[model samples]
Target chain A: GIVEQCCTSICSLYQLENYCN
Target chain B: FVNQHLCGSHLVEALYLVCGERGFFYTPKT
Candidate 1:
């Protein structure tokens, strides 16, 4: 199940990964 | 360089992504 919340409230994959790596 | 300086800066609505090697990312065009 999904909603419009996480899609907009959560951080994208690209942003998080590039942080440490 | 534009590393975490801009990476973590772009939070909310963005997820994490990486590669086997060195990789970088930025918040999508919103």
Candidate 2:
């Protein structure tokens, strides 16, 4: 989807998932 | 005149972000 505004106003790090138990 | 569809450029996809935020998601699964 494209960026849009709903007539309104106003980050990326990830941790690898632990091996499934 | 004031109409809901009178002045607007919008998009309402089958899937949308709640409160226009990403973290949370909302979809009807239609």
Candidate 3:
């Protein structure tokens, strides 16, 4: 799940406003 | 081209932020 992990990390880093839950 | 490959991979992974396994959904604003 490295890809998902990376995605989550990036999402958090960029603060995906309307994306992350 | 190796550069192209690398960029392509990065783009693919970068896009995961929106639509990968942990994909997000659009919630209708009310």
Candidate 4:
């Protein structure tokens, strides 16, 4: 759960930067 | 020529990583 939380935070930041698409 | 050599070295490094994980599971110290 901790790792997932950290990964979600990282993913959200990347989403803001449009790096995940 | 040199590029292939580096990739070859990196391949072995990956093997160590793959095998090392199996090794730890076989004998977990922690």
Candidate 5:
């Protein structure tokens, strides 16, 4: 998850969109 | 193109999507 990359500790479905389609 | 979450899609075996009277070329392109 980008949570660790950005060090925000929070993220959304920005990555999961491909699976939804 | 955009990078999204890693996902999965099944390998769908498709049928003859085209038709002709004489025949055609069978391509196995990904």
Candidate 6:
């Protein structure tokens, strides 16, 4: 569910790196 | 998708929303 690519390309609301990655 | 899921498949629900927006909706409720 926490896909980095989707976070940026689709979920621009947050940065993939900002997540608990 | 619990309460509504128990009803008809997505297709049935899709028909319920046919009154607006997108011309087509997927069948088999989610």
In terms of lDDT, the best-performing candidate is 3
Which is better, 3 or 5, measured by TM-score? 3
Taking chain B only, the TM-score of every model is: 0.17, 0.17, 0.31, 0.41, 0.21, 0.32
Q: Can you write out model 4's per-residue Cα lDDT over A1-21, one digit (the tens) per residue?
A: 212332333222222222111
Sort order, TM-score high to low: 4, 3, 1, 6, 5, 2
Mark the regions of model 6 whose C-alpha exceeds 4 Å error after superposition.
Answer: A1-21, B1-8, B20-30
Candidate 6's C-alpha lDDT? 0.30
Instruction: Return the candidate ranking by lDDT, descending.
Output: 3, 1, 6, 4, 5, 2
Choose 1 or 3, whichever is better by DockQ: 1
Tell me the DockQ of each model, to 2 decimals: 0.16, 0.03, 0.10, 0.02, 0.03, 0.04
Best by DockQ: 1
Report the lDDT tens digits of candidate 2 across residue range B1-30: 121111122323311222234432322122
What fraction of the reference structure's interface contacts does model 1 contain? Answer: 0.18
Give chain A TM for each model in order.
0.21, 0.14, 0.27, 0.25, 0.24, 0.21
Write one digit per residue (lDDT tens) for candidate 6, span B1-30.
111222224323333343334343323213
Instruction: Pull out the clashing pairs in model 5.
Output: A15-B5
State in Å the error of residue B30, model 4: 41
Per-model TM against the reference: 0.22, 0.14, 0.24, 0.27, 0.17, 0.21
Q: Across residues B1-30, which tens digit of lDDT does each residue of candidate 4 receive? A: 011121323433433444554431111123
CAPRI-style quality class for the chain A–B interface of candidate 5: incorrect
True contacts kept of 5: 0.00
Q: On residues A1-21, what C-alpha lDDT tens digit does candidate 2 reach at each position?
A: 112212222100111011111
- Mind sharing the TM-score for model 3? 0.24
Q: Kindly report the root-mean-square deviation of model 6 from the true structure over all alpha carbons.
A: 14.2
Q: State the lDDT of candidate 1 residue by residue for A1-21, as single tens digits.
A: 012322445433444554444
For model 3, the stretches where C-alpha displacement exceeds 4 angstroms are A1-13, B1-19
lDDT, candidate 6, A1-21, per-residue tens: 323233223422222223311
